């Protein structure tokens, strides 16, 4: 159903290790974090890979498009790509 799913991915990216917390707890945790975010009971493999792919190319947007590419939310790669298409000599 509807979720921020975002909020899981940044939670998941962010979690640190704690020492009093332990290695297989902290797996649990990171394990609940990924799930929620790619929630892959509602995604096939190729949509979660698309995911991961597009994960990556918001990272390496050059820095002085990145306020751009972000207040415009493109949702999936192929939209970053035309976008990047027609964004670009700035």
Not at 45 to 63: A, G, H, R, S
Request: aromatic share 10%; proline share 6%; charged share 30%.
């Amino acid at each position: 159903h509807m979720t921020d799913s975002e909020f899981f991915h940044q939670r998941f990216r962010n979690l640190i290790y704690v020492e009093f917390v332990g290695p297989r707890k902290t797996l649990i945790k990171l394990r609940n974090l990924c799930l929620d975010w790619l929630q892959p009971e509602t995604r096939t493999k190729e949509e979660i890979i698309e995911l991961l792919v597009l994960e990556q190319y918001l990272t390496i947007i050059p820095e002085k498009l990145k306020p751009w590419v972000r207040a415009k939310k493109p949702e999936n790669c192929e939209k970053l790509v035309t976008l990047l298409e027609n964004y670009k000599e700035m």
